[PDB]
Coordinates of N, CA, C and O and ligand atoms in Angstrom, one line a residue:
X1 N 0.9 -1.0 -0.1 CA -0.1 -0.1 0.1 C 0.9 1.0 0.0 O 1.8 1.1 -0.7
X2 N 0.5 2.0 0.9 CA 1.2 3.4 0.9 C 2.5 2.8 1.7 O 3.5 3.6 1.3
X3 N 2.7 1.7 2.5 CA 4.3 1.0 3.1 C 4.9 0.6 2.3 O 6.0 0.3 2.7
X4 N 4.7 -0.4 1.2 CA 5.3 -1.3 0.4 C 6.3 -0.5 0.0 O 6.2 0.7 -0.7
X5 N 7.7 -1.0 -0.1 CA 9.4 -0.4 -0.5 C 10.2 -0.7 0.3 O 9.9 -1.9 1.0
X6 N 11.4 -0.1 -0.1 CA 12.5 -0.6 0.3 C 13.0 0.6 0.8 O 12.8 2.1 -0.1
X7 N 13.3 0.8 1.9 CA 13.3 2.0 2.9 C 14.4 2.4 3.8 O 14.7 1.2 4.2
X8 N 15.1 3.6 3.7 CA 16.5 3.6 4.4 C 16.3 4.8 5.5 O 15.8 5.7 5.2
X9 N 16.8 4.1 6.5 CA 16.9 5.6 7.4 C 17.7 6.4 7.4 O 19.1 6.4 6.8
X10 N 17.0 7.5 7.9 CA 17.8 9.1 7.2 C 18.0 9.8 8.5 O 19.1 10.3 8.6
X11 N 17.1 9.4 9.4 CA 17.1 10.3 11.1 C 16.4 9.7 12.3 O 15.8 8.7 11.8
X12 N 17.2 9.9 13.4 CA 16.5 9.0 14.5 C 16.8 9.9 15.4 O 18.1 10.6 15.4
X13 N 15.6 10.0 16.6 CA 16.0 11.2 17.7 C 15.6 10.1 18.4 O 14.3 9.3 18.8
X14 N 16.6 9.8 19.7 CA 15.9 9.6 20.8 C 15.9 7.4 21.1 O 15.7 7.1 22.1
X15 N 16.7 7.4 20.2 CA 16.8 5.7 20.4 C 17.5 5.1 21.3 O 17.6 4.2 21.6
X16 N 18.8 5.4 21.7 CA 19.5 5.2 22.8 C 18.6 5.2 24.1 O 18.6 4.0 24.5
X17 N 17.9 6.1 24.6 CA 17.2 6.3 25.4 C 16.1 5.2 25.5 O 15.6 4.6 26.1
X18 N 15.4 5.0 24.2 CA 14.7 4.2 24.3 C 15.1 2.6 24.4 O 14.4 1.8 25.2
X19 N 16.2 2.1 23.6 CA 16.8 1.3 24.1 C 16.9 1.1 25.2 O 16.8 0.0 26.2
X20 N 17.7 1.8 26.0 CA 17.9 1.7 27.8 C 16.6 1.5 28.2 O 16.9 0.5 29.2
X21 N 15.5 1.9 28.1 CA 14.0 1.7 29.0 C 14.1 0.6 28.5 O 12.7 -0.2 29.2
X22 N 14.2 0.0 27.0 CA 13.8 -1.9 26.8 C 14.3 -2.5 28.1 O 14.3 -3.9 27.9
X23 N 15.9 -2.0 28.4 CA 16.7 -3.1 29.0 C 17.6 -3.3 28.3 O 18.2 -4.4 28.6
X24 N 17.7 -2.6 27.3 CA 19.0 -3.0 26.2 C 20.3 -2.8 26.6 O 20.7 -2.0 27.3
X25 N 21.5 -4.0 26.8 CA 22.8 -3.9 27.3 C 23.2 -3.0 26.5 O 23.4 -2.2 25.6
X26 N 24.7 -2.2 26.9 CA 25.4 -1.2 26.2 C 25.9 -1.6 24.9 O 26.1 -0.8 24.0
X27 N 26.6 -2.5 24.8 CA 27.1 -3.6 23.6 C 26.3 -3.4 22.5 O 26.5 -2.7 21.5
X28 N 24.6 -3.5 22.6 CA 24.0 -3.8 21.6 C 23.4 -2.7 21.5 O 23.2 -2.3 20.3
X29 N 23.1 -1.6 22.6 CA 23.0 0.0 22.2 C 24.0 0.5 21.1 O 23.5 1.3 20.3
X30 N 25.0 0.3 21.5 CA 26.1 0.8 20.6 C 26.4 0.5 19.1 O 26.4 1.3 18.2
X31 N 26.0 -0.9 19.3 CA 25.8 -1.8 17.7 C 24.3 -1.2 16.9 O 24.2 -0.5 15.8
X32 N 23.5 -0.9 17.9 CA 22.0 -0.3 17.3 C 22.2 1.1 16.9 O 21.4 1.7 15.9
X33 N 22.7 2.1 17.9 CA 22.5 3.3 17.8 C 23.2 4.4 16.6 O 22.4 5.0 16.2
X34 N 24.4 3.6 16.0 CA 24.4 4.0 14.4 C 24.2 3.6 13.5 O 25.0 3.5 12.1
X35 N 23.4 2.1 13.6 CA 22.9 1.6 12.3 C 22.2 2.4 11.6 O 21.5 2.8 12.2
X36 N 22.3 2.2 10.4 CA 21.4 3.1 9.5 C 20.6 1.7 8.7 O 20.8 1.5 7.2
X37 N 19.4 0.8 9.2 CA 19.1 -0.2 8.3 C 17.9 0.2 7.3 O 18.0 1.9 7.0
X38 N 18.0 -0.6 6.5 CA 16.9 -0.8 5.6 C 15.9 -1.3 6.1 O 16.1 -2.4 7.1
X39 N 14.6 -0.9 5.7 CA 13.3 -1.6 6.2 C 12.6 -2.1 4.7 O 12.1 -1.1 3.9
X40 N 12.0 -3.2 4.5 CA 11.6 -4.0 3.3 C 10.0 -4.3 3.5 O 10.1 -5.4 4.6
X41 N 9.1 -3.8 3.1 CA 7.9 -3.9 3.6 C 7.1 -4.2 1.9 O 7.2 -3.9 1.0
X42 N 6.6 -5.5 2.5 CA 6.0 -6.2 1.0 C 4.4 -6.7 1.7 O 4.4 -6.9 2.9
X43 N 3.6 -7.1 0.7 CA 2.4 -7.7 1.4 C 2.2 -9.0 0.3 O 2.0 -8.3 -1.3
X44 N 1.6 -9.6 0.5 CA 1.0 -10.8 -0.1 C -0.1 -11.4 0.5 O -0.4 -11.8 1.5
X45 N -1.4 -11.1 -0.3 CA -2.7 -11.2 0.5 C -2.9 -10.4 1.8 O -2.7 -9.5 2.0
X46 N -3.5 -11.7 2.5 CA -3.2 -11.1 4.2 C -2.1 -10.9 4.7 O -2.0 -10.7 5.8
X47 N -1.2 -10.9 4.2 CA 0.4 -11.4 4.9 C 1.4 -10.3 4.6 O 1.5 -10.1 3.4
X48 N 1.6 -9.6 5.2 CA 2.7 -8.8 5.8 C 3.9 -9.1 6.0 O 4.1 -9.9 7.0
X49 N 4.7 -8.6 5.5 CA 6.5 -9.2 5.7 C 7.0 -7.8 6.0 O 7.1 -6.7 5.0
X50 N 8.0 -7.2 7.1 CA 8.8 -6.6 7.2 C 10.2 -7.1 7.3 O 10.4 -7.6 8.8
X51 N 11.0 -6.7 6.5 CA 12.6 -7.0 6.8 C 13.2 -5.8 7.2 O 12.9 -5.0 6.9
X52 N 14.0 -6.1 8.6 CA 15.1 -4.6 8.9 C 16.3 -5.4 8.5 O 16.9 -6.4 9.2
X53 N 17.5 -4.8 7.3 CA 18.7 -5.2 7.2 C 19.6 -4.1 7.7 O 19.3 -3.3 7.3
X54 N 20.9 -4.6 8.1 CA 21.7 -3.7 8.8 C 22.8 -4.7 8.4 O 22.8 -6.0 8.4
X55 N 24.2 -4.0 8.5 CA 25.5 -4.3 8.4 C 25.7 -5.8 9.2 O 26.0 -7.0 9.2
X56 N 25.2 -5.4 10.6 CA 25.3 -6.3 11.6 C 24.3 -7.5 12.2 O 24.4 -8.4 13.0
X57 N 23.2 -7.3 11.6 CA 21.5 -7.8 12.0 C 20.5 -7.9 10.7 O 20.5 -6.5 10.5
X58 N 19.9 -9.2 10.5 CA 18.9 -8.6 9.8 C 18.0 -9.7 10.7 O 18.0 -10.6 11.2
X59 N 16.8 -9.2 10.5 CA 15.6 -9.6 11.4 C 14.3 -9.5 10.4 O 14.2 -8.5 9.0
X60 N 13.3 -10.2 10.7 CA 11.9 -10.2 9.7 C 11.3 -10.9 11.0 O 11.0 -11.6 11.6
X61 N 9.9 -9.8 10.2 CA 8.6 -10.5 10.8 C 7.4 -10.5 9.9 O 7.8 -9.9 8.3
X62 N 6.5 -11.5 9.9 CA 5.6 -11.9 8.7 C 4.5 -12.0 9.9 O 4.2 -12.6 10.9
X63 N 3.3 -11.4 9.3 CA 2.1 -11.3 10.3 C 0.5 -11.1 9.1 O 0.8 -10.6 8.2
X64 N -0.4 -11.2 10.0 CA -1.6 -11.1 9.9 C -2.3 -10.2 10.5 O -2.2 -10.2 11.7
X65 N -2.6 -8.6 10.2 CA -3.3 -7.8 11.1 C -3.8 -8.6 11.9 O -5.2 -9.3 11.6
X66 N -4.1 -8.3 13.1 CA -4.7 -8.3 14.3 C -5.0 -10.0 15.0 O -5.6 -10.7 15.9
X67 N -3.8 -10.4 14.5 CA -3.3 -11.9 15.2 C -2.1 -11.8 15.4 O -1.4 -11.4 14.9
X68 N -2.1 -12.4 17.0 CA -0.7 -12.2 17.7 C 0.3 -13.1 17.1 O -0.4 -14.1 16.7
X69 N 1.4 -13.2 17.0 CA 2.4 -13.6 16.6 C 3.8 -13.5 17.5 O 3.6 -12.8 18.1
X70 N 4.7 -14.7 17.5 CA 5.5 -14.9 18.9 C 6.6 -13.8 17.8 O 6.7 -14.2 16.5
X71 N 7.8 -13.4 18.4 CA 8.9 -12.5 17.8 C 9.8 -12.5 18.5 O 9.6 -12.1 20.2
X72 N 10.9 -12.7 18.1 CA 12.3 -12.4 18.7 C 12.7 -11.1 18.3 O 12.9 -10.7 17.1
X73 N 13.0 -10.3 19.1 CA 13.4 -8.7 18.6 C 15.1 -8.5 17.8 O 15.7 -9.4 18.5
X74 N 15.5 -7.5 17.5 CA 16.9 -7.7 17.5 C 17.6 -7.6 18.4 O 18.8 -7.8 18.5
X75 N 17.2 -7.0 20.0 CA 17.9 -7.2 21.2 C 17.7 -8.2 21.7 O 17.7 -8.4 23.0
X76 N 17.0 -9.3 21.2 CA 16.6 -10.8 21.8 C 15.7 -11.0 22.7 O 15.8 -11.9 23.6
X77 N 14.5 -10.0 22.5 CA 13.7 -10.1 23.4 C 12.4 -10.9 22.9 O 12.4 -10.9 21.9
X78 N 11.8 -11.8 23.5 CA 11.0 -12.8 23.1 C 9.5 -12.2 23.8 O 9.1 -12.1 24.5
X79 N 9.1 -11.9 22.6 CA 7.8 -11.2 22.9 C 6.7 -11.8 22.2 O 7.1 -12.7 21.4
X80 N 5.5 -11.0 22.4 CA 4.0 -11.3 21.9 C 3.6 -10.2 21.3 O 3.7 -9.3 22.0
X81 N 3.7 -10.5 20.0 CA 3.0 -9.3 18.9 C 2.0 -9.0 18.4 O 1.5 -10.3 18.1
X82 N 0.8 -8.2 18.6 CA 0.2 -7.8 17.7 C 0.2 -6.5 16.7 O 0.9 -5.6 17.2
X83 N 0.0 -6.7 15.5 CA -0.1 -5.3 14.4 C -1.6 -5.5 13.7 O -2.4 -5.7 13.6
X84 N -1.8 -4.0 14.1 CA -3.5 -3.6 13.2 C -2.8 -2.3 12.4 O -2.2 -1.7 12.8
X85 N -4.2 -1.9 11.7 CA -3.9 -1.1 10.8 C -5.0 0.3 11.5 O -6.2 -0.2 11.3
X86 N -5.2 1.3 11.8 CA -5.8 2.5 12.6 C -5.8 3.6 12.0 O -4.8 4.5 12.1
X87 N -6.9 4.1 11.3 CA -6.5 5.3 10.7 C -5.1 5.7 9.5 O -4.4 6.7 9.6
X88 N -5.4 4.4 9.1 CA -3.7 4.4 8.0 C -2.5 4.2 8.4 O -0.9 4.2 8.2
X89 N -2.2 4.3 9.9 CA -1.0 4.0 10.7 C -1.0 2.6 11.1 O -1.5 2.0 11.9
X90 N 0.4 2.0 10.7 CA 0.5 0.7 11.4 C 0.5 1.0 12.8 O 2.1 1.0 13.3
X91 N -0.1 0.1 13.8 CA 0.2 0.0 14.7 C 0.7 -1.2 15.7 O 0.1 -2.2 15.4
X92 N 2.5 -1.5 16.0 CA 2.5 -2.6 16.6 C 2.5 -3.0 17.8 O 3.2 -1.6 18.9
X93 N 2.5 -3.5 18.7 CA 2.3 -3.7 19.8 C 3.3 -4.9 20.6 O 3.0 -5.8 20.1
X94 N 4.1 -5.1 21.1 CA 4.8 -5.9 22.0 C 4.9 -6.0 23.1 O 5.0 -5.0 23.9
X95 N 4.5 -7.4 23.9 CA 3.9 -7.5 25.1 C 4.8 -8.8 25.3 O 5.2 -9.6 25.0
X96 N 5.8 -8.7 26.7 CA 6.7 -9.2 27.5 C 6.6 -9.2 29.0 O 7.0 -8.1 29.2
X97 N 7.1 -10.3 29.3 CA 7.2 -10.1 31.1 C 6.0 -9.0 31.9 O 6.5 -8.2 32.5
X98 N 4.9 -8.9 31.2 CA 4.0 -7.7 31.8 C 4.2 -6.3 31.2 O 3.6 -5.7 31.9
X99 N 5.5 -5.9 30.8 CA 6.0 -4.8 29.9 C 5.2 -5.3 28.5 O 5.0 -5.9 27.6
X100 N 4.9 -3.8 28.0 CA 5.0 -3.3 26.6 C 5.4 -1.7 25.9 O 5.7 -1.3 26.8
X101 N 5.8 -2.0 24.7 CA 6.2 -1.1 24.0 C 5.4 -1.1 22.8 O 4.9 -1.9 22.3
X102 N 5.1 0.1 22.1 CA 4.5 0.0 20.7 C 5.4 0.8 19.7 O 6.0 2.1 19.9
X103 N 5.3 0.5 18.6 CA 5.8 1.1 17.3 C 4.7 1.6 16.7 O 4.1 0.7 15.9
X104 N 4.5 2.8 16.2 CA 3.7 2.9 15.3 C 4.4 3.2 13.9 O 5.4 3.9 13.7
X105 N 4.1 2.7 12.5 CA 4.4 3.2 11.3 C 3.5 4.1 10.4 O 2.4 3.4 10.5
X106 N 3.5 5.4 10.3 CA 3.3 6.1 9.3 C 4.0 6.6 7.7 O 4.9 6.8 8.3
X107 N 3.0 6.6 7.2 CA 3.5 7.4 5.8 C 3.0 9.1 6.1 O 1.6 9.1 6.2
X108 N 4.3 9.8 5.8 CA 3.8 11.1 5.8 C 4.6 11.9 5.0 O 6.1 11.8 5.0
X109 N 4.4 12.6 3.7 CA 4.7 12.9 2.3 C 5.6 11.8 2.1 O 5.1 10.8 1.5
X110 N 7.3 12.4 1.8 CA 7.7 11.3 1.4 C 8.6 10.2 2.2 O 9.3 9.6 2.2
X111 N 8.2 10.4 3.3 CA 8.6 9.6 4.5 C 7.7 8.3 4.9 O 6.7 8.4 5.1
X112 N 8.8 7.6 5.8 CA 8.0 6.8 6.4 C 8.5 6.9 7.9 O 9.7 7.0 8.1
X113 N 7.6 7.3 8.9 CA 7.9 7.8 10.1 C 7.6 6.6 11.3 O 6.3 6.2 11.1
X114 N 8.4 6.5 12.1 CA 8.4 5.0 13.0 C 8.1 5.9 14.3 O 9.3 6.4 14.6
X115 N 7.5 5.7 14.9 CA 7.7 6.3 16.5 C 7.5 5.1 17.4 O 6.7 4.3 17.1
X116 N 8.1 5.3 18.4 CA 8.5 3.9 19.5 C 8.5 4.8 20.7 O 8.7 5.4 21.3
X117 N 7.6 3.6 21.7 CA 7.4 4.4 22.9 C 7.4 3.3 23.7 O 7.1 2.4 23.6
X118 N 8.2 3.8 25.0 CA 8.3 2.6 26.1 C 8.3 3.4 27.6 O 9.4 4.4 27.4
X119 N 7.3 3.2 28.0 CA 7.0 4.2 28.8 C 7.1 6.1 29.1 O 6.2 6.2 28.1
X120 N 8.1 6.7 29.4 CA 7.9 7.9 29.6 C 8.7 8.4 28.1 O 8.8 9.4 27.8
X121 N 9.5 7.3 27.4 CA 10.1 7.7 26.0 C 9.7 7.6 24.8 O 9.4 6.7 24.5
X122 N 10.0 8.2 23.8 CA 9.5 8.3 22.8 C 10.6 8.6 21.9 O 11.3 9.6 21.7
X123 N 10.8 7.8 20.5 CA 11.5 8.0 19.8 C 11.0 7.8 18.2 O 10.2 7.2 18.1
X124 N 11.5 8.8 17.4 CA 10.8 9.1 16.1 C 12.3 9.0 15.0 O 13.5 8.9 15.3
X125 N 11.6 7.8 14.3 CA 13.3 7.4 13.2 C 12.7 7.6 11.9 O 11.2 7.5 11.5
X126 N 12.9 8.2 11.0 CA 12.3 8.6 9.6 C 13.4 7.3 8.5 O 14.3 8.0 8.8
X127 N 12.7 7.3 7.4 CA 12.8 6.6 6.5 C 12.6 7.1 5.3 O 11.2 7.3 5.1
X128 N 13.4 7.2 4.4 CA 13.0 7.7 2.9 C 12.9 6.4 2.1 O 14.0 5.3 2.2
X129 N 12.8 6.5 0.5 CA 12.7 5.2 -0.3 C 14.2 5.1 -0.6 O 14.4 6.3 -1.1
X130 N 14.5 3.9 -0.9 CA 15.9 3.7 -1.1 C 16.0 4.4 -2.9 O 15.1 4.1 -3.5
Ligands
MYR1 C1 22.4 -4.7 16.1 C2 21.6 -3.6 16.6 C3 20.4 -3.9 17.2 C4 19.6 -3.0 18.0 C5 18.7 -3.6 19.2 C6 17.5 -2.5 18.6 C7 16.0 -2.9 20.0 C8 14.9 -3.4 18.9 C9 14.0 -1.9 18.7 C10 13.4 -1.9 17.1 C11 12.8 -0.5 16.8 C12 12.3 -1.1 15.6 C13 12.5 0.5 15.0 C14 12.5 0.6 13.4 O1 11.6 -0.3 12.8 O2 13.2 1.6 13.0
WPK2 F1 16.6 -1.6 15.5 C1 17.0 -2.2 14.5 C2 16.7 -3.3 14.1 C3 17.2 -4.2 13.5 N1 17.0 -5.5 12.8 C4 18.2 -5.5 11.8 N2 19.4 -4.5 11.8 C5 18.7 -3.8 12.7 C6 19.0 -2.4 12.9 C7 18.4 -1.9 14.4 CL1 18.9 -0.5 14.9

């Protein structure tokens, strides 16, 4: 849809703080902090795939909107994830150990804007088409 494409990270604010609030240790925060991943989003019927590719790590999720799935995150959390579409925004929630974080992906002009929230910390990442 609006989301399908190959996207490259162009900007990020507060991602270290976000990773810290998730419990990510220093070595992994250091690897994530200056990573400039690509995000490849595709759809085949009911099934949406999001690949995230960077020099040191590749991850992938495939899902159906509104159906919970098990996910291993890039920082090795084992989470239960659910993704829905709300007003054109893809809203992902991850739940583990009684905690939750939300990742919202939205299309704005030329950009794919991703907002990640954990407790009082909000991170914003912007991608542009590769
Ligand atoms: C190898 C570096 C891994 C860094 C671990 C980061 C923690 C996972 C949070 C990912 C939030 C997704 C944001 C996005 O799609 O831009
Ligand atoms: F959040 C991330 C997720 C990733 N998955 C693969 N490489 C990545 C780099 C970053 Cl920073």
